Amino acid sequence: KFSAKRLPSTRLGTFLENRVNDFLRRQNHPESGEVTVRVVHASDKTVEVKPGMKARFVDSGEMAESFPYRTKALFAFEEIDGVDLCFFGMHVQEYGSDCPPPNQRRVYISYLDSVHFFRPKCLRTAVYHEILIGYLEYVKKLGYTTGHIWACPPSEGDDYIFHCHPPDQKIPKPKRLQEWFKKMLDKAVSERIVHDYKDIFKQATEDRLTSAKELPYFEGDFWPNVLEESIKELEQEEEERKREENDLSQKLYATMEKHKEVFFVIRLIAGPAANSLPPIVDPDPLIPCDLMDGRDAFLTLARDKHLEFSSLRRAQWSTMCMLVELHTQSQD
């Protein structure tokens, strides 16, 4: 059988689904189904500093040329009427205790995506939040100190993870998505999972950040590209001054303040306890899976095989195909 449940389990997946199903049992809703969470990709990667920053800080020996991280893809499924539905997906980047500053003991949510067919409807959002809170709960247990989120909804017609969303699934505007993450984080705060959280601007200020090299630097994130753009801005200004004869940090602080409400810095472990921690040891094995290495492969598979997630029934058929692919691609 190629069911969701028969996908190879992990500590992380097991931890998440157990949290969600305990939550569902507590709600005792007659329409809810069993939820399965599976990590379907785990691999070692590195993000390398782009030219501008390498020139400024890497060649200077002030900053590592690259940072090692593990990427994970995980999906949540719901069984209803004995039928699998994939309804939530998320890719994360995890920077371990071996990672150089400024990235060590940090996790970053690359992207998350959903299709709105969870049953019952009235528990959908709560379940998403339980997945996210459990994730923060879990990495906090392993010893990561900080979580990072870039609250950015997809542009018109773009799919983050699931090809062809339901036409009537509304896409939240920035402010709504922002409030959504806050509600999730506030729950995590009341559960003493999250210590506190701040926008990127307030965090930098409190941390007394003085140099771009101090900003966490993640694969595909907003900040490495604004830094490259900022540096080219400096170069062109320098050229203006050249003609006339014939600060990075202040550019960054300015950009940080401008877009502060989109970027969350989430403190899992703060203060002293964040300083005498054992190495991070991840009990889960690597999980090679070309289909789920970042998001393009699955979008591409979906397009190629016409797997839409645009209705409940289309989503379930697509879910079956995805699962068959995940099962066979694993098999040797």
What's the min distance (Å) between Cβ of 87 and ligand COA? Answer: 9
CA proximity to 283, closest of 26, 20, 39: 39
What's the min distance (Å) between Cβ of 245 and ligand COA? Answer: 46
Residues contacting residue 109 through CB under 8 Å, at least 6 positions apart: 90, 91, 92, 147, 148, 149, 150
Site for ligand COA in 39-58 (CB under 6 A): none
Q: Is 293 exposed, middle or buried (0-12, 13-18, 19+ CB in 10 A)?
A: middle
Interface map 213-252 toward ligand COA (x if CB under 6 A) = ----------------------------------------
114 is in an annotated binding site: yes
**Cβ closer to ligand COA: 112 or 256?**
112
Backbone φ and ψ for 47, nearest 5 degrees, come out as: -105, 130
287 is in an annotated binding site: no
Interface map 148-187 toward ligand COA (x if CB under 6 A) = ---xxxx-----x---------xxxx--xx--x-------
Site for ligand COA in 81-120 (CB under 6 A): 111-114, 116
145 is in an annotated binding site: no
Residue with tokens 């959908």: 124
What's the min distance (Å) between Cβ of 25 and ligand COA? Answer: 21
Q: Are 194 and 267 in contact (CB under 8 A)?
A: yes
Dihedral sign for Cα atoms in the order 316, 320, 322, 326: positive
**Cβ closer to ligand COA: 104 or 114?**
114
Max CA distance (Å), the chain = 78
**Cβ closer to ligand COA: 77 or 160?**
160
- Residue 113: both structure tokens together: 């995506």
Under rule CB under 6 A, residue 264 binds ligand COA: no
- Residue 58 carries which DSSP code? I
Residues 108, 111, 114: CA angle, nearest 5 degrees: 135
- Contact residues toward ligand COA (CB under 6 A) are 111-114, 116, 124-125, 128, 151-154, 160, 170-173, 176-177, 180
Which residues are annotated as part of the binding site? 112-114, 124-125, 171, 176, 180
